[PDB]
Amino acid sequence: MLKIIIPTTMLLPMTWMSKHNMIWINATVHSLLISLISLSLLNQLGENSLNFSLTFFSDSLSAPLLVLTTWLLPLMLMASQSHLSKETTTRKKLYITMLILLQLFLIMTFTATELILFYILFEATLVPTLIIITRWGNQTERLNAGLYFLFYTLAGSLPLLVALVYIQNTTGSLNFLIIHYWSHPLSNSWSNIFMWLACIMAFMVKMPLYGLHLWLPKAHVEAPIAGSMVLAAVLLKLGGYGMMRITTILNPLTNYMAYPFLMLSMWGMIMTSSICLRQTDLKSLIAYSSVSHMALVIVAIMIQTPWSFMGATALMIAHGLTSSMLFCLANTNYERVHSRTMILARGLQTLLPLMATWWLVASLTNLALPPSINLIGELFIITASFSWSNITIILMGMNMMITALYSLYMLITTQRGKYTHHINNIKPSFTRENALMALHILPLLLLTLNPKMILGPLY
Amino acid sequence: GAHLARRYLGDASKEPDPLRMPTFPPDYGFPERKEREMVATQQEMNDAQLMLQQRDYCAHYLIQLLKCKRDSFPNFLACKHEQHDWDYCEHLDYVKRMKEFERERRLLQRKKRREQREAEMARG
Amino acid sequence: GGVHIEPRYRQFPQLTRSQLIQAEFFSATMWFWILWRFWHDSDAVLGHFPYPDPSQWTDEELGILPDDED
Amino acid sequence: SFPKYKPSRLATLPATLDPAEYDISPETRKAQAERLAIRSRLKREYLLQYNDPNRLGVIEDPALIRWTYARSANIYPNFRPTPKTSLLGALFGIGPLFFWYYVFKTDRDKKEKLIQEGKLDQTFNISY
Amino acid sequence: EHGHSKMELPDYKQWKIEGTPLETVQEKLAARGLRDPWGRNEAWRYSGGFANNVSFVGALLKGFKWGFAAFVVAVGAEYYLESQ
Amino acid sequence: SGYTPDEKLRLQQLRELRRRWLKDQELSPREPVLPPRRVTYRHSIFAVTHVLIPVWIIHYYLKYHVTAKPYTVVERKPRIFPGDTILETGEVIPLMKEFPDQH
Amino acid sequence: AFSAPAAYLTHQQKVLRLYKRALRHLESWCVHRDKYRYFACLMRARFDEHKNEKDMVKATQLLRQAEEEFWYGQHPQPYIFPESPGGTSYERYECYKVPEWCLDDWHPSEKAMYPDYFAKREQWKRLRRESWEREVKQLQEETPPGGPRTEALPPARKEGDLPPLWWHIVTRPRERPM
Amino acid sequence: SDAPPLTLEAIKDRVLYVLKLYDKIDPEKLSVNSHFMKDLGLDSLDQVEIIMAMEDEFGFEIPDIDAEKLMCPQEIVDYIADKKDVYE
Amino acid sequence: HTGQEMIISNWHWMTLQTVELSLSFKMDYFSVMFIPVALFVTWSIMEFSMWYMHS
Ligand SMILES: CCCCCCCCCCCCCCCCC[C@@H](O)O[C@H](CO[C@H](O)CCCCCCCCCCCCCCC)COP(=O)(O)OCC[N+](C)(C)C
Ligand SMILES: CCCCCCCCCCCCCCCCC[C@@H](O)O[C@H](CO[C@H](O)CCCCCCCCCCCCCCC)COP(=O)(O)OCC[N+](C)(C)C
Ligand SMILES: CCCCCCCC/C=C\CCCCCCCC(=O)O[C@H](COC(=O)CCCCCCC/C=C/CCCCCCCC)COP(=O)(O)OCCN
């Protein structure tokens, strides 16, 4: 695994020893090459895992997340090139350093054979994101947003640490392989109930769970474009990955303890999809859509059936790509209009036709149009839920209908109708933005050809 | 339908329920009780694989009709005779079904008449 | 791809004889087809097999005994 | 006399059936005149800024920003715990959760019992 | 290529109320003491090729004559051919 | 009622400006200055590039790759009627039970 | 559409608008032209019998019963001209309307085609640049203190002046740009 | 479409045609600049009827606010030309 | 002529444990009868559109 970690570390001295006007080119080229190298982790086994060493191991759940993490950095650099133009070389190098450190921590987090090492890196990712949000955000609310994004996380994560060390004091190890092979049932006890809660709540808060989702709209709205991209694409999936790893020690207590979270997610997906219908801000609408999709992923993980896990993996990958694309489109509009109010700039199809095509395809993938991987994950989760209980179909279908409604509402409001007359600074789309949009969308339509790459270890 | 008016506006016990027909023994009327005759066997009627609801006592004419259509593919109009033979057999089948309906209706009439005559005799 | 027909402003529009002859031809073809089918195939509309009268069936063939035999 | 039209929330009263327009007064006329004055002043400011050849951007709209700020950021500082607010929040935020919990719990208990007696007919049920 | 022929309007004195339903409209209007001032503006709808009308059944029987003739010729030829 | 004199004058001036703009929207005889630069026959070539090549590719793919695997193409087991004979075996299906033919 | 609205509609304007609406809806009811002409002459007669009423209270009690009767018998599916706000081709060609400023973003290779058009466009832009400076002063001096009362604009007064705020009325895209 | 690009001459001729077919006006005294209220002695009901005739003859609707201040055939022609963007 | 019927499962897409998903076409009476009708109607529609949507 060092053949990916070491180049990502070398990205830092290369960035800091670069010319003042070569940082973006060098960073983009070498991050793309690192993505290409990481692409060879996809050759997974039907047996246990790719156990590289005592410290790092790869799995067909970890490999798609690793590849998406490596692929996201070049897109983040391309998106950040525009709004950082008027800023000094040292500060741009610091921004690229924060992005590189975030990638390094995420890469080490997804392999992380140890649960304490996983926790340490899973919490180390917090610092670069907070600095990016509270340093290079625009509005005055960013500081407040950062505070939320901080404390919520720690409010969930501090009990987990205690639980973790407690387990190693009883089991003797926190290695995931030993934990899986030596797993034992949890008796229905108050102590075991609180151990279950301490294990679950940390990952629940970062999905986020419906009741615990307040930090996400603030953090995603006030963050710069690279921050929003990394928050929606990779950082939300840490909770799902952690739950998928940790639910192996929580059986059979998950059967009883899953009910409040299942109800919260099943009702909150409807609530947040309905919230999307009445939203005056593009970024907030995209954030609430992310909350709905992650609610579906929470349901899938809580059901803990093979089809549930496959659907959850597919949906995590598809949502990451789609939400990053949607945020990039919103930012392309914002850098022209500087308002971030959906109703202000209207009828952009007549002025930006190719960008309108990008908007249409992004809305189509968000709408879960078959045979996209978005719908593959959606349908697998829905079928698993139907087997779990036939009444889930009402909530699932209502969520599908509202999702289509708000996706097409977002498309029609911004692209169709009549152009706003007083806005005359809508310049033609740059090659950088179109390239960014294509680099988001072609991986999705190309992954629909080989779904088993993103269906997880239970395929 | 006229039968519906006599079963919905008149007496329900006067006329049959089409679901439960017949309600009387077959050989009740006359002791001959001839059997129905089937020409197509199991195997050929399976091999032609007509339809489950086409697998009735009219199957042989359908077999002939199907064969005629198949041989004369270009001249679709040529096999007029096969169609007539098949619809005539279906007409006979439908006439027999109507005869069963009328038969059971008359038997119901006679049974009601017998019971009312017996009741009159007993009360007298 | 058509012919040049100028506006008219409150008279009957100009008509080519081609469209008139085609419309008349196709109307006549439709009526001829209807007549030809009716002549050759009248039973597709009127029916071929007479409907039996259930009240005309004798009590013998339906197995009815005069209320005392069985 | 003809049948009377009864207005509703989603089918409002027509302008030509409004009794207020038929009841004219000098105060009503001056109110209309000064409403037109406000509208004309706003229109003049907008068109003066709109036709300007030097302007090369979005014309800032205070009304739109007031709308968005009121919709998003003015809510909580103007919130008070009130019997209406408290009961509505409790109902609309708890009742659906417990209702769905009851429904799903009853369905799953019935399913589990039926599996216990074995009278579910789970034949060909392979994928779950 | 477009329709550039310099179309000239017809004479305005051409249109009359006489011989149209506008005539009986004017008659019934005069029975109560009124007049129709826009009658001649609508006379062109009853004047030229629009003067003659066809019934609904007549519209249905658009090509019955020549189709019927084709039918009778065909049936006679078939009767002559099969009687051989 | 009617226009005030100022309304007439403003409408007339705006009308003249608008008509001059509309006239200026027209194209000169050379206006599309195109920059030129390079580096049964129609039906016959169309029926080759759009019918013959796709059917060749699809027939090759079906006959040599799809049919290679079992159960990929499954047919209907054509209908067998009395009096028919079979190519593979050569035996003749017996006729039916000589039902009475009358009307 | 073009004309600036007033603060209110006078009684005569209300009566004339009701006359037009009732005639249009009667035309919707009376499909044929002769029947429509007869009933429209009757309708005009029924308007005319109270043309000379001097009592404003009487005239206002009228037009009210009249609009109530109209709302009762208003043909819930009236005929609409296709380009009218309720027609079947109302905003059909708005997607083809492109603003004129977009031409400023064209590539020089695109402007190499159509050179005469862009020369005339440059002339128009220069005219706008000078006329705007004249227009601002003229509007400032002509507007009454405290702000405008009606959104009606004055014409040009001098020889070389252009009507104030003329650019976006003169440079409309077209009724059917494509 | 194939609709001819109508010109000012056609609009003027068609407006005068519709007006001469209005029998409350004598055609020989009619002129393009003749006022409806005073030069021809027409009531405002006649004016709205004339507007309706123009609408029905050109196939589009003139709004009440614009229609109620059109008092000459010439300015009716000008309004139609401005609405339809006629060059000459 | 014959009544010929096929299933053409040409491309095998993902397999889900005991469930196999493949690109399969059903070529029964309904498909082979409806396809020519739809193609004929669409051909007429496109020829009509060449005139209706010319502008
Ligand atoms: C502009 C108008 C169109 C012009 C172009 C016309 C041509 C269109 C044709 C292309 C689309 C039509 C679909 C037809 C697909 C043909 C190719 C396909 O069959 O191959 C696929 C093969 O492709 C791969 O399966 C999918 C590609 C994998 C995508 C990886 C993403 C690239 C990395 C980018 C970074 C990652 C970002 C996202 C993180 C998760 C599936 O093959 P498969 O039967 O299975 O096995 C392969 C061969 N074997 C048997 C020898 C093994
Ligand atoms: C706010 C946004 C979302 C945040 C996250 C919300 C999710 C948290 C929900 C916690 C999951 C369940 C907690 C406890 C489940 C135990 C089962 C219990 O509910 O059922 C009865 C439990 O009975 C009563 O609940 C006893 C406890 C009563 C006191 C609890 C307080 C009630 C409301 C508190 C909710 C506040 C949550 C937030 C706290 C800050 C059954 O009684 P019994 O069969 O005999 O004993 C079963 C347990 N044994 C077997 C181990 C002995
Ligand atoms: C987003 C903000 C959420 C904040 C945190 C939410 C998670 C809360 C989970 C509990 C926190 C601490 C739990 C302890 C960690 C696990 C350790 C463990 O399981 O050991 C138990 C110990 O169990 C405990 O001590 C639990 C005590 C909990 C005290 C703190 C209560 C915090 C609030 C309680 C109500 C809310 C609970 C769920 C909240 C969910 C989040 C909203 C049994 O060990 P022994 O006692 O040694 O062996 C038994 C024989 N003696």
Ligand SMILES: CCCCCCCCCCCC(=O)SCCNC(=O)CCNC(=O)[C@H](O)C(C)(C)COP(=O)(O)O
């Ligand atoms: C078929 C759909 C339903 C139809 C039902 C509607 C029923 C409507 C009939 C009601 C009768 C009325 O007129 S309602 C009576 C309203 N009041 C008056 O008429 C008083 C003075 N009249 C005017 O002022 C007019 O404008 C006039 C002088 C005519 C022209 O003026 P010009 O000189 O400035 O053109």
